[PDB]
Design a binder for this molecule. Structure first.
Ligand SMILES: *[C@@](C)(CO)[C@](*)(O)[C@H](Cc1ccccc1)NC(=O)[C@H](Cc1ccc(OC)cc1)NC(=O)[C@H](C)NC(=O)CN1CCOCC1
Ligand SMILES: [Mg+2]
Lengths: 212, 235, 244, 222, 240, 231, 195, 232
């Protein structure tokens, strides 16, 4: 995995790859690493597949129960802390999870929480998580500004995952894009790297390391 | 004294039969099932005019496709609802689907008899559980503290129930619309209620497949009260 | 089964009273009177022993006054055996607080916990309540000198002067009459003894039918001293106030 | 020291058509360099038009299949004989597998059937419960030999339209039951040649709206 | 464990132990809550058959649950401490997991649920306590006043009273409290609270406690003179 | 009188009144009938409604592919006992790869109900059951009473006015016992039997409930339009 | 984590805590506050094993806040430090111990005195004029032995702190992304914004 | 976690037209020491099932007690205990398979490999294997230990697939089994000459043969072998 999510002028961008690995064996190229917890809350998945899948679907059930009991949508802070407190109970048992809880609420605004299986929980504007995080950081950090347009931010997120998909042997498949605003999350499609790489190479004039 | 799980000589559990009396002292709750939806309505019955009536929560969401109204010792319902919500969400977690209205009701009715010498007494509250699912469509269930549940086309519980049920017997037919059913609940509530029915001391709700379970606002119900009186003056 | 023989100690009367607590208070009303009086510079504890026999060992005896820690003491009214169970609990609770915080326990905190234990016996478990009322006399650096009382209900209140046990109605009237806020310890001593002298069911108050204690700042500079009076010392203070 | 796991070999294969789905598996059971059985079936009809196979460590595989079959039975009792949809079965199996996250079933699991719109479906699991719906999946020993062949022949990967300068991809299309069974048989004969744990017999279960049919074929026994 | 079902149904459908717990509340000292336009006030009677009290150290009738919520009560004093302690623990637990202080409705719902659990659990009797819970939700200036009771039912109140002679002061509040125009200022709200207590109390001396809660964790307890001023002002306006 | 306070008390004549009061709940229950040939076993149950707006309480429960019962009395107690049976039938399959003999099913129900009649705090079950099944020794019908007593029979009935149907079966015995290889005729004899227990009301489409099990017939329940054939 | 310092001067206690949060070869955050206010006049900084640090700090925080509400009274820095030590002393013999070192800086309102307590994960407590956890101490203790005086002002304490941070940035192998400084005195807790 | 102490070697078995045959030697080894020589490792259950057990003998004896107890329990309140409701081989097997897998799942295995041979009530032949891991499989020929490596190949020359079973008589089948037992005695260092053999036939029932011996052994060619290469 490579996953990222960053905050900017126009909300939150969330971009993830779609590869599953079993060592050097490519297990899948078409895997969903984003979970839509609710219309205003997203969760990203990196690490052990089922650990992430099982416990973030469980997180969704806990968030659903909160709004039934409190007649109100759970805060991003509270949703992230349910997940972090859960994994902390299992600390040492060998869970492997690198997650980002992204979403909007009126009281918080757009918010991103990094939560991992060591029990670390951090609020922040930018995170990249997974085996290809460094590759994504390299592109994102050198092109990131707060004042990016929704169009440019969407592309930068897409291009950052592409960068990692290329260099990281354990990332690839396709880019899944999301945009989160005051009105909730908006899906911006699946982008197969098989076609996207050549489209980007040609149009951008980049990736000159490759035989074109 | 005498055991909590004792049978009477007539073959009934004393404690269950006594909890049934407690339910008859409860505020009126009515439910009507149609092909366009199920309507749930209740008498709020504030004990004093200083009590803020919108804080009286007697109609309650269980899931998006299941709703619930109560009558009797309403404090006893809190844990029953908590169970229902957990059962409903848990089923969705295990099976990636909505849970059947009957199965939900059955899960709640299992709690009912878990009393004796588990909890110390039966519940002192009856529930109307209304919802929709793909298999059996729109449904209304009456869940007693005996652990028994009946499906109903229409049903009233609480103090005004015997009179309201007789009225529902005549008025219900298989081609009722949702609008007609809303009015019918309001009509029968105003009949059996002590104080005069208004948008503050009565509350409506429905569950439709499209929009799920909704509690009506006091503004929305007010217009249905006005629409009801206008239609009764017109003959 | 066993249901037949259950008294149901933790239930309400139709009037909303706790039978067993009410009856425990009735038991306490026949116990030797205990008095607490709080002054600006100390606290007095005085208590009347239950009809003594001349062959009782008076000097090596402890029926009424108990030391909880260095800064806190209690006067007992009711079943001694019940009180000793609670006292050892209180003594342990104080040592836990000191061990946890490296600070002597605030008087109220100790009082609240003992009273919380009593409360539990009225609400759950189906056991009889403790037939005991305490007067707590103590000092800490927050509120200074403090008097509290607790009873079988688990309810506790603070006092300037208070009595428990027998003839508290008579004793409280007398205390209310002669007590004043600027009062000193030595005056409070005199008040305590004069009050017992008038409320007693005995013919006359003597040294061998009394237990007596003071908590003053009477040590050397900014520190507290508990004085549990010896028999000869009570005999002296009884002469000095003209009761004998 | 006691090793509670073992490798019983074999390999399995799931392909989904438009209005059908196949779940195939060889019938050989092995330990180390020995053959235990030339015909030991490991693809089962579990009811409600769901077929299941749990390849790897047979004792864990049989345990899982047995539990899921039981899960279907109680689903009927508890929910008024309702049909267990393929998506619901998958999620149920995730919880079975993850229930033993810290002492796993050593199995790669595949189920096949029809989704709620009547279309063919294949779901596949890792040993601890992560799952995914696909048109195509091989599992077990020879998965590494068969899977890339399926990527090429079922999803037409790396295949472009002739004379389009490698610009237009070969379009995806559903396969007939006749074509799918050809790919299954060729996949298994290829796997048998080059993997020692695969051989003896091939057993295919085909799932349509009309029910579950079986087909059997001999494989090389060396 | 002691298992006995103490709270049980009678043939008429009543739970006598719950109802007798209400009788204990009726015996308790009066308590009243009035909420203004921008404040809530909690008034509490203190029975004056107890002179020689030490008022510094005697448990106050209004207890802070958190910096933004208070709880007063009528009924058994010992029972109230158990509900208060639990409520305080839940308040800190809510801050820890949700990263937000409790709403007044949530905190009320918790205390009500505890009270209810003691009406259908073996070996225990119900709490002989009804509570008034007041305060302001985090980042909200709309005031909240709730009441709970031994059965476990809870509800919101514009203004409300509990304890002995509460039916007298509820009568007073019912004509003297306008929903359309609630006490605009703090002064107005405290005045109405004291007036309603003066219908019942005896003498407005050390018999009345007042606690004023404002938004953003602004809670203060009034003292003798500050209360006595309201008393003197109300009596002078009376003689007319 | 003085000896009906709980299950753990004998009367001076040697009776257990709480068990007898539990038996009384069955008499108030709606009638249900059981009967068998050598090839099939049948349950016929009259279902009861609360009023005309309500559903008709379901009386028949499936326990396994080869076994199930009908209830008369407290329905939740039948749910507990049927669930226990479902588990026991299932334990037999998973562990021994063996369908549970109907006779053993009876023995297990007896022993479960009995424990509640000797312990303090508990209560007897307030329901009667009729178990039908087809196993390795052919078709079977059992009658369970909550005292613990279980009885194997050719046919029987329990509930209100069950005496009528029970006499008919006692007369008809030699006829219905030989209805082999004919499901529809054995059901008819059951429907005719239950009709001897009717008063004022008669059998309608949503009022009647029939179940059957046999040689090449899994335990299946018939309700609604699928029982119209037999009225 | 890694760098947490503390200096007690005449009238205040100054705590300095590094802002970096690192995992693997990525600095995930450069603005992390490694501290929790236990009460208005008591502040605890923390450093150690990931997850444990915050979980422990917030658990201690809740407990002290619960005490404050119950008694309507603020616990002394000495009492809080003793409570915290006991919790760590329990922890070390648990199934899985809290691997967290802390510094507790507080102003005692009864004594009108600042107090600095250094406590490691084993439950080893000491009151010090200046303290540090981790490798920091290997540079700062000797520096402060030389430059520190007991009668220094809060401003002189901050200059002394800059001298520590300068030395650490010069000689420490890791980039800890500077520090957040907080002062604890009679008027409560406040943060220095420009450091 | 165990380690096996006193052990039994191969158990071999096969199907034939009317029934099944199973055999196992009578040795209880203690490492390389051939400690005990009167050990019966074929245990009949009723008159329609034989359970052959290899591996740890203490655990075998435990399994004997379970099966013996199973018969008793099945008879309780069962008028048809010797008829329709008698223990089937499939019932006995599944019970053992259940136990084996539960024990491995609690990291405390019964250190055995088991073959349940019998005939079902409907006449069908039953032959299925289970071991310490709870692994189960069925085949026309089954064998444990060295048996799997040396017996199976020989037995499979007789019955190579399902369709060869009706063609195989009991005379042919028993001959193959007795020959296999000889080969194992030549080549297994923890085997003995003495063994027991059991036939479960659908017509003639259970025949249990004890005290059999390996005979007709070729050893004469040994006298010609000298040295290891160059010796004359
Ligand atoms: C990239 C591809 C690096 O692996 C991502 O982290 C990716 C995230 C992901 C998220 C959701 C769904 C699929 C994939 N992770 C993987 O693909 C993951 C890599 C991984 C394996 C094992 C780990 O052990 C702690 C940690 C990471 N691959 C898997 O989970 C694969 C599909 N399953 C297994 O390896 C089965 N294992 C899981 C651990 O228990 C033993 C069996
Ligand atoms: Mg080979």
């Amino acid at each position: 995995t490579t996953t990222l999510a960053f905050r900017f002028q126009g909300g939150i961008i969330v971009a993830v790859d779609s590869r599953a690995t079993a060592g050097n064996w490519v297990a899948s190229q078409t895997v969903k690493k984003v979970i839509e917890i609710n219309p205003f809350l997203l969760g990203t998945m990196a690490g052990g597949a089922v650990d992430c899948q099982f416990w973030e679907t469980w997180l969704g059930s806990q968030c659903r129960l909160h709004e039934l009991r409190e007649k109100e949508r759970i805060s991003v802070a509270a949703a992230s802390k349910i997940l972090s407190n859960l994994v902390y109970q299992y600390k040492g048992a060998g869970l492997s999870m690198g997650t980002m809880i992204c979403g909007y609420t009126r009281k918080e605004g757009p918010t991103i929480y990094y939560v991992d299986s060591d029990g670390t929980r951090l609020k922040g504007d930018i995170f990249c998580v997974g085996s290809g995080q460094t590759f994504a950081y390299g592109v994102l950090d050198s092109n990131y500004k707060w004042d990016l347009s929704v169009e440019d931010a969407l592309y930068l997120g897409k291009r950052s995952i592409l960068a990692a998909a290329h260099r990281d042997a354990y990332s690839g498949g396709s880019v899944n894009l999301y945009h989160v605003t005051e009105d909730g999350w908006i899906y911006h499609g699946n982008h197969d790297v098989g076609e996207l790489f050549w489209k980007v190479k040609e149009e951008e004039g980049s990736f000159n390391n490759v035989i074109g | 004294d005498r055991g909590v799980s004792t049978f009477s000589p007539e073959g009934r559990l004393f404690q269950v039969e006594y909890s049934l009396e407690a339910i008859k002292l409860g505020s009126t709750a009515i439910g009507i099932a149609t092909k366009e939806g199920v309507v749930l309505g209740v008498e709020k019955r504030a004990t004093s005019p200083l009590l803020e009536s919108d804080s009286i929560e007697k109609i309650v969401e269980i899931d998006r496709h299941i709703g619930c109204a109560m009558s009797g010792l309403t404090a006893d319902a809190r844990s029953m609802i908590e169970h229902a919500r957990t059962a409903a969400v848990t089923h969705n977690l295990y099976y990636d689907e909505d849970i059947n209205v009957e199965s939900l009701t059955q899960s709640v009715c299992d709690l009912a008899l878990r009393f004796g010498e588990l909890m110390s007494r039966p519940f002192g509250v009856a529930l109307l559980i209304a919802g929709h699912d793909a298999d059996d469509g729109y449904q209304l269930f009456h869940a007693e503290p005996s652990g028994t549940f009946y499906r109903y086309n229409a049903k009233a519980i609480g103090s005004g129930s015997e009179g309201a049920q007789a009225e529902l017997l005549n008025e219900w037919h298989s081609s009722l619309t949702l609008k007609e059913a809303e009015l019918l609940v309001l009509k029968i509530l105003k009949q059996v209620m002590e104080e005069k029915l208004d948008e503050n001391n009565a509350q409506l709700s429905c569950i439709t497949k499209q929009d799920g379970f909704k509690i009506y606002d006091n503004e929305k119900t007010a217009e249905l009260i006005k629409e009801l009186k206008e239609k009764e003056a017109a003959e | 089964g066993s249901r037949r023989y259950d008294s149901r100690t933790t239930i309400f009367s139709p009037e909303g009273r706790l039978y067993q607590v009410e009856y425990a208070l009735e038991s306490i009303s026949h116990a030797g009177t205990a008095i607490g009086i709080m002054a600006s510079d100390g606290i007095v504890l005085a208590a009347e022993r239950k009809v003594t026999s001349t062959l009782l060992e008076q000097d090596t005896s402890t029926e009424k006054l108990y030391k909880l820690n260095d800064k806190i003491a209690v006067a007992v009214a009711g079943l001694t055996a019940d009180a000793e169970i609670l006292i050892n609990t209180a003594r342990i609770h104080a040592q836990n607080y000191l061990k946890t915080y490296n600070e002597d326990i605030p008087v109220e905190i100790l009082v609240r916990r003992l009273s919380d234990i009593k409360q539990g016996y009225t609400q759950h478990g189906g056991l009889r309540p403790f037939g005991v009322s305490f007067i707590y006399a103590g000092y800490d650096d927050r509120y200074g000198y403090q008097l509290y009382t607790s009873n079988p209900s688990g309810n506790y209140t603070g006092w300037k002067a208070i009595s428990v046990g027998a003839n508290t109605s008579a004793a409280q009237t007398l205390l209310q009459m002669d007590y004043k806020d600027d009062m000193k310890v030595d005056d409070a001593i005199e008040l305590a003894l004069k009050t017992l002298s008038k409320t007693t069911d005995s013919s006359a108050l003597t040294y061998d039918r009394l237990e007596f204690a003071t908590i003053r700042k009477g040590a050397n500079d900014g520190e507290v001293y508990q004085k549990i009076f010896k028999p000869q010392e009570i005999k002296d203070i009884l002469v000095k106030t003209g009761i004998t | 020291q006691f090793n509670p796991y073992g490798d019983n070999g074999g390999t399995i294969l799931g392909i989904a058509g438009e209005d059908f789905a196949v779940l195939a598996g060889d019938t050989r059971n092995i330990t180390d360099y020995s053959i235990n059985s030339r015909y030991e079936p490991k693809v089962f009809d579990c009811g409600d038009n769901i077929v299941m196979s749990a390849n790897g460590f047979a004792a864990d595989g049989d345990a899982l299949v047995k539990r899921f079959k039981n899960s279907v039975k109680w689903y009927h009792f508890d929910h008024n004989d309702k049909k267990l949809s393929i998506n619901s079965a998958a999620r149920n199996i995730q919880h079975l597998l993850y229930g033993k996250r810290f002492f796993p079933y050593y199995v790669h699991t595949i189920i096949a059937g029809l989704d709620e719109d009547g279309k063919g479906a294949v779901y596949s699991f890792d040993p601890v419960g992560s799952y995914e719906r696909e048109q195509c999946r091989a599992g077990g020993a020879a998965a590494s030999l068969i899977m890339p062949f399926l990527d090429n022949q079922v999803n037409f990967k790396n295949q472009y339209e002739p004379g389009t300068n490698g610009k237009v991809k070969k379009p995806l299309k559903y396969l007939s039951v006749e074509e799918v069974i050809k790919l299954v048989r060729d996949s298994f004969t290829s796997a048998t040649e080059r993997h020692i744990q695969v051989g003896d017999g091939l057993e295919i279960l085909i799932v349509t709206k009309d029910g579950v049919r079986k087909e059997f074929y001999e494989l090389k026994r060396d | 464990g002691y298992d006995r079902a103490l709270s049980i149904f009678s043939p008429d459908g009543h739970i006598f132990q719950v109802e007798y717990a209400l009788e204990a509340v009726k015996r308790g000292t009066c308590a009243v809550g009035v909420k203004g336009k921008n404040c809530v006030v909690l008034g509490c009677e203190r029975r004056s058959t107890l002179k020689l009290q030490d008022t510094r150290i005697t448990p106050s009738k209004v207890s802070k649950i958190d910096s933004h919520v208070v709880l007063s009560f009528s009924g058994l004093n010992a029972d109230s401490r158990i509900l208060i302690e639990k409520a305080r623990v839940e308040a800190q637990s809510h801050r820890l997991t949700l990263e937000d202080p409790v709403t007044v409705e949530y905190l009320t719902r918790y205390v009500a649920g505890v009270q209810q659990r003691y009406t259908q659990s073996g070996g225990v009797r119900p709490f002989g306590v009804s509570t008034l819970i007041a305060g302001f939700d985090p980042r909200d200036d709309e005031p909240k006043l709730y009441q709970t009771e031994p059965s476990g039912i809870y509800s919101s109140w514009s203004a409300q009273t509990i304890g002995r002679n509460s039916k007298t002061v509820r009568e007073f509040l019912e004509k003297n409290y306008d929903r359309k125009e609630p006490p605009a200022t703090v002064e107005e709200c405290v005045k109405l609270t004291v007036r309603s207590l003066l219908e019942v109390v005896q003498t407005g001396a050390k018999n009345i406690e007042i606690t004023v809660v404002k938004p953003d964790s602004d809670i203060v307890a009034l003292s003798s003179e500050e209360i006595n001023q309201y008393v003197t002002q109300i009596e002078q306006e009376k003689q007319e | 009188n003085n000896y009906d306070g709980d299950t753990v008390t004998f009367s001076p004549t040697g009776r257990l009144f709480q068990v007898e009061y539990a038996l009384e709940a069955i008499k108030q229950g709606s009638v249900t009938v059981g009967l068998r040939s050598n090839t099939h076993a049948v349950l016929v149950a009259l279902k009861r409604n609360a009023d005309e707006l309500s559903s008709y309480q379901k009386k028949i429960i499936k326990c396994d592919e080869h076994m199930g019962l009908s209830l008369a009395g407290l329905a939740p107690d039948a749910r507990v006992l049927s669930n226990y049976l479902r588990q026991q039938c299932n334990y037999s399959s998973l562990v021994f790869n063996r369908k549970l003999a109907v006779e053993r099913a009876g023995h297990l129900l007896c022993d479960k109900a009995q424990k509640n009649t000797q312990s303090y705090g508990g209560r007897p079950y307030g329901v009667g059951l009729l178990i039908i099944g087809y196993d390795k020794s052919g078709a079977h019908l059992l009658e369970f009473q909550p005292s613990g007593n279980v009885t194997e029979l050719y046919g029987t009935a329990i509930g209100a006015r069950s005496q009528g149907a029970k006499t008919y079966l006692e007369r008809t015995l030699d006829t219905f016992i030989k209805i082999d290889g004919n499901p529809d005729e054995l059901i008819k004899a059951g429907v005719e039997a239950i009709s001897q227990s009717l008063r004022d009301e008669s059998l309608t489409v949503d009022n009647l409930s029939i179940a059957i099990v046999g040689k090449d017939t899994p335990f299946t329940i018939y309700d609604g339009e699928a029982v119209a054939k037999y009225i | 984590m890694d760098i947490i310092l503390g200096i007690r001067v005449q009238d205040s206690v100054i705590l300095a805590s590094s802002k970096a949060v690192t995992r693997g070869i990525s600095v995930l955050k450069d603005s992390d506050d490694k501290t929790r206010q236990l009460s208005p006049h008591t502040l605890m900084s923390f450093a150690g094993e990931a997850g444990d640090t915050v979980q422990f700090a917030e658990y201690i925080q809740a407990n002290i806040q619960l005490y404050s509400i119950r008694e309507d009274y603020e616990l002394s820095p000495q009492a809080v430090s003793s409570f915290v030590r006991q919790e760590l002393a329990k922890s070390i013999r648990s199934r899985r111990p809290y691997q967290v070192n802390v510094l507790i800086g507080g102003y005692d309102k009864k004594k009108n005195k600042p107090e600095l307590y250094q406590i490691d994960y084993l439950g080893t407590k000491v009151e010090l004029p200046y303290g540090a956890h981790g490798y920091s101490g290997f540079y700062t203790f000797s520096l402060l032995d030389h430059h520190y005086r007991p009668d220094m002002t809060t401003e002189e304490g901050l200059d002394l702190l800059k001298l520590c941070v300068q030395e650490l940035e010069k000689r420490m192998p890791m980039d800890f992304k500077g520090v957040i400084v907080k002062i604890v005195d009679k008027d409560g807790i406040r943060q220095v914004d420009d450091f | 976690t165990q380690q096996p102490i006193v052990t039994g070697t191969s158990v071999i078995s096969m199907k034939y037209d009317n029934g099944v045959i199973i055999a196992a030697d009578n040795l209880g080894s203690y490492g390389s020491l051939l400690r005990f020589n009167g050990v019966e490792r074929l245990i009949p259950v009723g008159d329609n099932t034989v359970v052959g057990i290899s591996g740890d003998i203490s655990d075998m004896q435990h399994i004997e007690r379970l099966l013996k107890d199973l018969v008793t329990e099945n008879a309780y309140d069962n008028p048809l205990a010797d008829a329709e409701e008698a223990l089937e081989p499939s019932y006995i097997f599944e019970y053992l398979a259940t136990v084996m897998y539960q024990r491995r799942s609690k990291m405390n295995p019964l250190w055995n490999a088991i073959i349940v041979a019998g005939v079902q009530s409907n006449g069908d032949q039953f032959l299925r294997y289970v071991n310490l891991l709870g692994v189960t499989y069925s085949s026309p020929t089954l064998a444990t230990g060295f048996g799997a490596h040396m017996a199976n190949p020989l037995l499979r020359k007789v019955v190579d697939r399902e369709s060869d079973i009706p063609k195989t008589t009991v005379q042919v089948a028993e001959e193959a089994i007795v020959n296999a037992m000889r080969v194992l005695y030549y080549r297994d260092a923890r085997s003995s000459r003495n063994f027991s053999l059991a036939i479960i036939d659908k017509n003639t029932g259970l025949t249990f043969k004890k005290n059999l011996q390996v005979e007709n052994m070729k050893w004469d060619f040994a006298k010609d072998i000298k040295g290891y290469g160059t010796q004359k």
